[PDB]
Amino acid sequence: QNITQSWFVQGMIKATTDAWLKGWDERNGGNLTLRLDDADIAPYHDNFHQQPRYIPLSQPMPLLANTPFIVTGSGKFFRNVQLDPAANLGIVKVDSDGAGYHILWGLTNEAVPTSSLPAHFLSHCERIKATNGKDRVIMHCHATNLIALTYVLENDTAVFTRQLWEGSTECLVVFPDGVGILPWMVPGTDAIGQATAQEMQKHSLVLWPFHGVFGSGPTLDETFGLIDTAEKSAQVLVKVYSMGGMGQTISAAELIALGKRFGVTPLASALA
Amino acid sequence: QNITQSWFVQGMIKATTDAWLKGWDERNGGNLTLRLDDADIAPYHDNFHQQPRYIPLSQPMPLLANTPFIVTGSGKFFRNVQLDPAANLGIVKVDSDGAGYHILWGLTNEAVPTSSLPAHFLSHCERIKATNGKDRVIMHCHATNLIALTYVLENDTAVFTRQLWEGSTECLVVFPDGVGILPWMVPGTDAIGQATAQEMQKHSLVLWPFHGVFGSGPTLDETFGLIDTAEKSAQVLVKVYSMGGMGQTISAAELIALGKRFGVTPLASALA
Amino acid sequence: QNITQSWFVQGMIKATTDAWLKGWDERNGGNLTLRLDDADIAPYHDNFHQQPRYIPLSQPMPLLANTPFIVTGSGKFFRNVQLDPAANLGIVKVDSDGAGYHILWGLTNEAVPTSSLPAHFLSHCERIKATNGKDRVIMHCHATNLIALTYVLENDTAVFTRQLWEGSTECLVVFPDGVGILPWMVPGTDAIGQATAQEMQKHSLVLWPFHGVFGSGPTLDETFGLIDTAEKSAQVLVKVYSMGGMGQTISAAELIALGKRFGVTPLASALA
Amino acid sequence: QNITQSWFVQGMIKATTDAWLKGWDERNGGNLTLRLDDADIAPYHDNFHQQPRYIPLSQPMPLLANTPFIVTGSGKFFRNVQLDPAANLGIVKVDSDGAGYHILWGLTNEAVPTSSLPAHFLSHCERIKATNGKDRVIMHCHATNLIALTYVLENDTAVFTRQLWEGSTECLVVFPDGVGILPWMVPGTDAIGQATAQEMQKHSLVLWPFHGVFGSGPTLDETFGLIDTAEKSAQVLVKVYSMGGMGQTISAAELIALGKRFGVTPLASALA
C-alpha cells in the first residue's frame, strides 16, 4: 500500500479532521506532531520520490537524533489534511546530531513544517523524560470552551484544574496532574516554547490564555481524548456559569475518594 | 454475510457513532450493552475464529444464564466503533449458572468488556423484571446539557422530572415515570451499580450528577431516542435558564391533560 | 430507476436528514408531508408490490380527492429515513370522495402515516386555498431555539414576529406575514389541528409553545428554508438575550423600508 | 475531465458546503464569487453546451473587462451546491467594455447570478486596487456569532476590532486592518454596494449589522479562513459575555507586541 494508507498517515488525517469538525481549528489554527520509529516508515520508502530537504534547528536536540516524525505544515488547514495529506503533512527525520532535520515525504510545493515545530520538539523532549519514552504526540488546538474560560477564571493552575475536575467526573482520573496555565505570551517565540516545555514536565495539558491548549500523550487517540475530555468539561462549565453558576458540585472529599479508587495521585493544590 | 453486517453489529455502530456525533462520548466516556437471542448470533458462527475467553463475575446472575449480549469494550472510544467494530465491541455469552461469561467474538488484542458490565448486567436484570422481558438495552453516555443541569437544579427526582417535562411537550409521554437521580457516587463501584439498578425498577432513565445518564429500552433506537428526548429538553432548558428563566411554561394541569390523552400515568410527585 | 431514486423520495430523505442533523428531530419528533401529482408517481407503478391498505378519515376532505402524498410514518425517526425510506415513508392517495386514503407504497411491516396526518391534511387544504394551489408541503419539527424563545417571549404573534424580523435582516422578506402563535394545546387532538389550520390561513409559519413549529411552502427546500430562516433568527436572539439583550436592533422604520424595497406587505401589527 | 471536477468548481463546492455546515447560510443566505483567468476555463470549453446569455450591468466596470468569474446563483441554497453545481453556480465573463456579462456555463433552467453580483463586482474592483490584483474572492455569509455581537457591541469599527482581536490571539495577525462596520442598510441597494466597496479599501472584512459579513482574499481557503477566524473569535466572545464578561483579556501592550513580532501594522485606533 501507499504510505497514505499507513496507520500513521490515516491517524493524522483522523485527528486533524475530527478537531476540524469540533470547531477547534479554524484557518491554520492548531498543529500536530507524532514521533515515529524508523520501522514504521521503512516499508514505505519507495513512496519517497523527492530529495530530502534540509532545515537546520536553532536549538539542537541530540535526544531526538535520527528520530522520524510526522507533522502538520506551516499555514496549512486541518480541514484540508483529508483532501491532500501529502500537501498538508510531512514526514521529517532529525539528523545524527539533532542540529536539524530532513523532510522525507510530503509538504509538497515547497511547504515546510509548522513554525511551532521547534517548540513541539522541546516538549517532546520533556515528555520523553517525564514518561520514560511513552509519550509520542504533541497536539495544539484552539479548543473553544477552554479558550472562553481563560477570560473568566483566574489564570492559575489550581483554580482551573479544580473547576475542570468538577465539570465532568472522569476529569480527575484522565488528568490527575491537572492543567498547567501560562501567562499570555507572544506565540512563535523561544520564550513560549521554553515555558510550555517546562510545564510539560508537570502536566500533560498546558493552557495558553486567550489562545488554546497543548496536550501530550502516547498515541493520537489518547492525546485527542485527553484534550476532548478537558474541552467537554469546559463546555459543561460554560453552560453552568452562563446559567448563574454552581448550586452544587463535586466536593474535595468526593474528588479525593475518586483518586483513591482509580489509583491516581491528584494535584494536591486543587483539593481545598 | 459477515457478522459485521448483521443488524445488531450495524445497530451498535449506529448508536455509538450517533452518540459520538452528539458530543456525548468524549474519549472512552459511555458504554452500551444489548441483550440478544441465541438465534441472532447462531447464523454467524463461522465468523468466530478464536477460543472463547472466560471472565468470572463477582456477583453471579442466574437470570442471565446462557444469554448473549453485544457490548462496548473497556477503554474503547465510541468514535472508533465504526472504524473497527471487532476491536471495539464484543459478543459475550453468560455461562450456565450466571457465574461468569465467555467472550465469543471481537474485543481483539486482549480487550475486555466495559468495566461497567457487571453494573449493566444488574440493571438488565431489574429491567427484565420491570418490563416482563421487553427491555434489552442499557446505554450510558455523557449527555452534555443533562450534565450541566445537575449543577443548577435540585438533585431531586421530582424537581428534575418536572423541568424536563416542561422543556419539551413530548417528554411526559416519552418518560411518564420520570428521571431518577442518584447522589454523586464513585463510578465503577458495586454501590453505584446497585443504586442504579434499584432506580431502574422505577424509571427508564437514571441521572448521575456531574457525570451523565443511564437509559434502558427494548431496542437501540428506542433507548437512544429516550436519552435524546431528555437531552433535547435539557438543551432547551439550558437556553431558557441562560436567558433568565421561564416567563411561561407547561402547567401541571396541561401536563395532566397530556398524560390522560396519551394513556400514560405520570409520576404524581412531579405534578404540583 | 426505482422510486427510491425519484426526486420526491430523495427530497423527503434530504429534508428529514437535514432536519435530523440540525437537532430538530429527536426520536419521532417531527413529521413531513408532500403533495404530489399522479404524474409524479405513475412512472414508478411497477415498484408497488403490495395491496393498498385503506385507512378512513374521520373528517373527510373532498378538496384532496384523488390526490397523492408522500408522508413520514407514525413513530418513525427522521434519522432513519435515509437508511430505509420504504420503512419510514409512505405514498398515500386519498380516495374519490376524500373519506379516506390508500397506502400505495412503503410504510412496510404494517407501519402507518404520522398520527398528525389528518391535521396535515387540514392545513394542506387551507394553504391550497390561501396560495391558489401553490403550496405543497407541511413540515413540523422541534426547532430548538424557537422552542426556547416560547418560554421567554410573550406568546403573541406581533411581539414574536417583530423579534424574529429583528434577529436577521432577511426575515421580514422571507416571512412578511409573520409567525402565528397558538396557546399550548394537547398535540394529536382535533382542536390543535383546527387551530393550526386557521392560522395557516394568515401565516406560512405557526408556533406551538413549548413544542415546535409548523411550516408550509411550495417545495421541500422553500419550506425547509423558511423554517431554517426563522430558527436561525431565533438562534441569534437566544445568544443576544443570553448576553443581556439588545443594545441596538433593526428599527420599525428600517423594517418598513425593507418591505418596500422587496415589494412585500409586512404584518402591520409588528411594526410599532 | 468535466469542469465539475475542476479545481475552481470543486473549490466553490467546498466553500459553500463548509459554510452551510457551519450554520452560516440558511436558505439562500450568502453569496460567493471567484475571479478566474481565461486559462482556468479555456481547457473546459467543450463542456459549454448552451448559448451565452447576456446580462447588462447598470454600472459598467472596465477594470473587469474580459474577466471570467464563477459565482453562486440568485435564490440558490449553499446546501445544494454539492448536489448540482451546474444548477447553483455559473461561470460568467464580463464583456469587452465592462457594460455587461455573458453567462457561459451553469445557472441551468434560466437561473441568474446572485442579485448581489454588481456589489461583488464593485468590491472586487476596490480589492484589486488595494492589493495590486492579488485578491480574487468576495464571500458573504450570515456568520451567526458575528451577527449576534452586532446587537450588543457598539457598531463602531475600533470597538469591534479590539474585541475580536481580544477574542483569539491570531486575530490581530489574520486581520491587522480590523473589521469595518457599516450602519444597517437595505440589502440589494446601490448604496450598500457602494458603502461596502469603500470600506473594502481599508479592510478585508466588512460587517453588516443585524445581517452578516463580507470578506475578501486571494483564494477561497484564505477568504473562508479569514471569516472563520473572525467568527471563531465572535463565538468565544459570545460565551464570555454570556458568562458575565471578561475578568481578564489581551491588553493593548500585548497586542502591539504581537503585531511587532509578526511584522504587521495593526489598526491604531483599536489599540487604547
Ligand SMILES: [Zn+2]
Ligand atoms: Zn495556536
Ligand SMILES: [Zn+2]
Ligand atoms: Zn505546573
Ligand SMILES: [Zn+2]
Ligand atoms: Zn461515564
Ligand SMILES: [Zn+2]
Ligand atoms: Zn426513583
Ligand SMILES: [Zn+2]
Ligand atoms: Zn411535535
Ligand SMILES: [Zn+2]
Ligand atoms: Zn395569526
Ligand SMILES: [Zn+2]
Ligand atoms: Zn445576506
Ligand SMILES: [Zn+2]
Ligand atoms: Zn473603515
